[PDB]
Each structure stands twice: as structure tokens, then as C-alpha cells.
Amino acid sequence: AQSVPYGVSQIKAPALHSQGYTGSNVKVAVIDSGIDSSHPDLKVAGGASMVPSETNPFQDNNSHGTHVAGTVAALNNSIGVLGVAPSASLYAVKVLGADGSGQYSWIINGIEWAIANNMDVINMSLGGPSGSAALKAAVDKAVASGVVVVAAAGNEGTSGSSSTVGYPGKYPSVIAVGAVDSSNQRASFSSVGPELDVMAPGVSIQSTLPGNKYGAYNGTSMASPHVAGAAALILSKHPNWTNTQVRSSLENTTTKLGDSFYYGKGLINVQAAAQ
Ligand SMILES: [Ca+2]
Ligand code: NA
């Protein structure tokens, strides 16, 4: 028996699945800890590792990349969960080790791989407090190249009047995603600031874990893949739309939630965005 995690329903993904739009032929790169390609509820189309220590992107030592991957694209079958874009072509771009730590060079190499490999959407459920000119140039390049780039806003909460949006989420070319719960309430951990773009469900998100398991996690890393999945649904309905058009559609059709410093534009609604 399959279950639909609440976050998939919240963003109105089942409305698109009902129409027959499930993300088919859309290439999504999950730039994270790898994806357990053996999970019965996932199909991994390819990938590459950027970790010089761990060559196999298809082994997830951390769990994170597998959980993110299941929010984007857990298969529509009789088992497990359901992803936002269950027919999307998932690619595992390993940039983080078993510790969940990476190098900025590894991340940049993963972005570059995704551009060279004609990915449609990049998800980066990662962030740090410090950016780099090379990191900015990579995200900017991916955008200029036609990629939809989505990232977690960060789990820094509030800090006075300061923005707490991490990098690369802080860059204007990236869609930075904050986290709400099932009641549309911002999660206390969710980073804030002018650079926050949209919100998605990020509290108690059930998804796939390595070794044929399922579990729930909290974080803006869990909100991000809802938006990356949403961009894959939009492209499956409108394959001729640019990344610019996908982004605008998602930002312009949100359910407004509260002050933009805390909530950005509000909650994404894929049914409205898919127009
Ligand atoms: Ca399933
Ligand atoms: Na941003």
C-alpha cells in the first residue's frame, strides 16, 4: 500500500497527476549525499560523484540525498510513498560524504556536471553561512544555461534583523525555499530574509531512506525538493517554457502567507502554476 505524504497534497501535486502530468522526461539533479538506487520506491537514471573519496553516487551513506530524492520522485506504484514528480528522471550528484560535509569545489563540480548533462532542474538541499564568487558564478551559469535552480533557504531561524538565508539560496538566481508545516505555519528553524522566495512543506516529511526504509525529517532541505518536483511537473505540461517562465509561474501563483521576510511569496501551488 502506497501513502501520499501530506506535503505532496499540500502543494496540489495530485491535481497534476490527475491530469496526466507526472514529470515525465524532465531531468532533475539531486545535488546531495547520493541516492540509494536500490530502493524499491526509486528509479535513478544516472549520476556522478564529485567526492574524490567516494566514487559511487548510488550509495548514500548519509541518508539525506535519498530522502530528498523520494520527495521529488518516489514512484507511483503499490508501495512506499509518492513523489511530487513521480515520472521525473532522477540523477544522483554526490557532493557530500557520509558526514554530510562537502567542499565548495565539489558542489561547483556537481553544478557543472548538471549543466554539461542537460539537467532541467537542480535541487540543492544544502547551504552554508559563507558564499564564494566561484559558487555564485556556477549557479548563475546554470540559470543562464536554462536550468531551474532550487535550494533550501537554511535552518538558521531568526537573528535579529539579519538575513539568515544560507548560500547558495541567498543568490538572486536561485529559488530559496523556506519551510512551513501542514497548517501553513513557518517552522521556527526556517531561515528568514529578503532572499527567501517561496515556502513548501518541511516539517515531518515522510520519504524514502536507504535500505528499503521510510522516515520523516524536518528542514528546509525537505521543503526544497517539493519546489524542484513542482518545476518538473510544470515542465512536463509545458516543455517549451524557459526556467524564467517556470520560476515566474511558481512565484506569481503562491498562496500568500505572511510577511515576505518570513514567508517570501508564500506557499507554492503547482495546480495554479501549471496553467
Ligand atoms: Ca510509491
Ligand atoms: Na534567492
From Swiss-Prot:
Binds 2 calcium ions per subunit. It is an enzyme of class 3 (hydrolase). Ca(2+) 1 binds at Q2, D41, L75, N77, I79, V81. The active site is at D32, H64, S221. One of its GO terms (cellular component) is extracellular region. It is found in: Secreted. Residues 5-274 form the Peptidase S8 domain. Used as a detergent protease. Sold under the name Alcalase by Novozymes. One of its GO terms (molecular function) is metal ion binding. Its cofactor is Ca(2+). It catalyses: Hydrolysis of proteins with broad specificity for peptide bonds, and a preference for a large uncharged residue in P1. Hydrolyzes peptide amides. Keywords: Calcium, Hydrolase, Metal-binding, Protease, Secreted, Serine protease, Signal, Sporulation, Zymogen. One of its GO terms (biological process) is fibrinolysis. Its EC number is 3.4.21.62. Monomer. Belongs to the peptidase S8 family. This is Subtilisin BPN'. It comes from Bacillus amyloliquefaciens (Bacillus velezensis).
